[PDB]
Amino acid sequence: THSHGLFKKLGIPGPTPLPFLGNILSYHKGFCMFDMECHKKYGKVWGFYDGQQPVLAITDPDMIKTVLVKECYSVFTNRRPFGPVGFMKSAISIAEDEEWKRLRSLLSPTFTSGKLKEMVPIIAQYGDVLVRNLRREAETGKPVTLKDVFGAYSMDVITSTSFGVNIDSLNPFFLSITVFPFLIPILEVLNICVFPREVTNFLRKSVKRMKESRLDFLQLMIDSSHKALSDLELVAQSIIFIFAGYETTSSVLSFIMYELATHPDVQQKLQEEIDAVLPNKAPPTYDTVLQMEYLDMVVNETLRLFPIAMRLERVCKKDVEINGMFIPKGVVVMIPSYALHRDPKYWTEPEKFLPERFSKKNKDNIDPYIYTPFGSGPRNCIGMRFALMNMKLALIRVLQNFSFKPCKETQIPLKLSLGGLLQPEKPVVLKVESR
Amino acid sequence: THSHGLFKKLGIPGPTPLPFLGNILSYHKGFCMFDMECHKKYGKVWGFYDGQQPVLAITDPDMIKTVLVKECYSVFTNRRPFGPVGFMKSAISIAEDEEWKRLRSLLSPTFTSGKLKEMVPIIAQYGDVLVRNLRREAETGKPVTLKDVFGAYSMDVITSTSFGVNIDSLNPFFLSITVFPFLIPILEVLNICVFPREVTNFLRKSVKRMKESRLDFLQLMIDSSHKALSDLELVAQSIIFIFAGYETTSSVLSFIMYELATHPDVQQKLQEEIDAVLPNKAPPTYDTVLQMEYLDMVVNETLRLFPIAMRLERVCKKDVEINGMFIPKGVVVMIPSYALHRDPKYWTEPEKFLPERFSKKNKDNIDPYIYTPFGSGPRNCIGMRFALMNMKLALIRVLQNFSFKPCKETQIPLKLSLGGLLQPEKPVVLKVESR
């Protein structure tokens, strides 16, 4: 526990670390309550220790811009190592330094404004499966678990958008990682993997069946100043894209319908805009989705209250002095997204759901280095524009046909998962009525 | 690699161990070819090293009886430690010393001749589901994967026989364990488990739902000179019983139909006996199943060629001198079942399928410490009698309605899985015809 003197040395405040465990006992309320607490206790800058690992929290918008944008390529290029990963080390979210720059370049043109516009005709199909799957549990007044019917939709979208397969989708340990990061190299040599060695084995061969069948995201990889992309590295990117495109889309869509249900005036104000831009229940298109500003305002304000990443992190790969502060090599620099999204020194009534904060009359009084639901700089969420489009296309088709009211078992107020990831404690269950 | 001199010291022959790896590179053809080889090379007794771990192979029937029966309780009480297991350490197949004696006593009366006879009326249902599920893929001349329709049956049997749930069941790393057994205690403290932490979490709560619902194998545990049984220890026994009752029953049943197909004279000789004891396609009963001797002869001879355990093992918990041989504390004593089941110094034409070896005219010329498909002594297969009854009840109802012929894709001869477990390389697929 010799490393527990770094912040005492640097004169940076923070909680006193216990030996070996560091400050991780504080995570007993979740990452987010710990961040919101430390933010209040120490101010703009503090540090703590995930085990022996020093973690410096920064909340200064200038310092955040320095870390995420100005000094990304040079110092803050990678995140805090994750293991064991196995062959998934070559996935873009996990790859480091030059290996990541190459996969970023090769995978970037997948989410152009043009490649997205090609997917709107394809996404529209499963939105109608989503309505019809919802029309069944609606004509029977049985409360609906949203993440089920949303995840069935989100799953349908990601398989075809990246590959082309069409399916009606109705057919405890990481605690030790941070106290035993020295055990990560141990597990890497045992082929153990946080990704099950079966799901990966399924897709590794499934992709090489799809590759040698047509011969989409699967198309653009074999098609492409660097080297070219490999094959086991092609499977790894698909696995990242399939996870994100499913669990992020479904979880946020569930978060949105909970708020639309507990704020019926906003749910009606949005249903009115959807019928105006799309009269006669018109099919949403790429350009109509980009016209609905109150839909974007709802999506944005929901992602303020539930930034599913909670924290942004970068590893300081060498000694730097950013915005007048010395940061030694090896430190993980952390931006507490959840805490800043709820900071009263920037948001009025930050626990209330108020989409009007993002009105064009008010969207200017909002610092983009405080509101970072997708990150910033060269390593932001590569699938941001696709995520916004995917969700918005789902809300339109769903609110065009249904209205949502709370039930007896609806968790009000919603308890967040006091665990790790950002999910609700109890699932989101609402009553669906047909218009 | 200081431990690699033990057998050189004891004057026991065997392959020369490489540093760290021991003799495990020899496993490149499977456990069984290694045993059959070493048996020929060195004779009645040899040793080798799984990593640093000394393993003494014995083939002397007297010495085998000493280890398995005479000296079981005193010296050879447990098998070679298995990890990581987590809460499954309390399962009977895995439990050691006194903890195992208690679970053996508490779980033994589950497989009495009387408790088995109570299950014959219940097993008969899914045998008819098995026929009807087979009548579908038979009236369409589509070759059948036997382990699918057998595993669907074996799964149906084990859930109701132990609990009572009825369902129509149509709705890479252990290599490092033996070079890094010092890593087993490492993994135990990370909650990692060779049993997925999800399947176990499913049944842990599923059982405690069943426990507090009725309030069978599930019945007799809460009902019972020892202490009494726990609850997390109740889930652990269920998991052992469900695995064995599924994968053993299905795999052997597949092995039997492959042989009945490649030896049509035996398949007809057995169909004639089944129709004689059970005329008009009579329903098999507990006592009729025990009357068919040629059915028992087929089952026995199949289990000679494919003893799904391959090896029996016991840990020598203290220095002993058994049958004139010194065996030091810590050594794993191993009986190469597969090798002895194919030893020409005991079997004539041991690669040929010949059920007549087990005729009552010939069943006496067979040493029960050479033919050990279920083990021997106090720690033999506790579910032997149930396994024989379960399989025999399936063969009767299946051969009463169908005959089996090889296909174009039928693997002839059957290659064993050159891996670890005893399975076929390619699945067993045969043509099914309706009588």
Ligand code: HEM
């Ligand atoms: C509501 C939906 C989503 C949210 C809120 C979200 C948020 C984020 C955030 C905060 C980051 C880290 C940014 C940073 O470190 O500065 C990230 C990274 C990433 N996201 Fe998303 N994401 C979403 C959906 C998606 C989707 C649909 C994909 C499709 C593949 C995707 C792919 C990625 C990838 C590949 C990265 C890592 C990129 C890199 O490291 O270069 N995300 N996301």
Ligand code: HEM
């Ligand atoms: C064809 C079917 C089966 C075969 C060939 C088989 C074979 C074996 C063998 C060789 C052993 C080790 C015996 C020894 O070490 O001396 C064993 C142990 C065991 N078997 Fe089976 N088995 C079969 C089916 C079953 C079934 C249906 C069950 C039902 C629960 C079962 C439960 C067990 C248990 C609990 C043990 C460990 C007992 C102890 O350690 O005290 N087996 N089996």
Ligand SMILES: CC(C)(C)OC(=O)N[C@H](CS[C@H](Cc1ccccc1)C(=O)NCCc1cccnc1)Cc1c[nH]c2ccccc12
């Ligand atoms: C330090 C190093 C460079 C090695 O990389 C990281 O250690 N990265 C971690 C990877 S966890 C997760 C792994 C996983 C597990 C099981 C199935 C599939 C994937 C994942 O790869 N997910 C990327 C997809 C995604 C999710 C959410 C939002 N968008 C995109 C954590 C992490 C980095 N960026 C993030 C933005 C948001 C949320 C978590 C992370």
Ligand SMILES: CC(C)(C)OC(=O)N[C@H](CS[C@H](Cc1ccccc1)C(=O)NCCc1cccnc1)Cc1c[nH]c2ccccc12
């Ligand atoms: C040394 C120690 C005392 C600790 O115990 C052992 O290390 N025991 C090993 C356990 S592997 C397997 C584990 C498992 C994994 C995943 C799901 C379910 C179970 C299992 O528990 N299976 C018992 C059921 C069974 C299977 C086959 C035939 N009958 C009964 C190996 C072993 C001991 N006896 C055996 C007879 C036959 C085949 C393997 C073994």
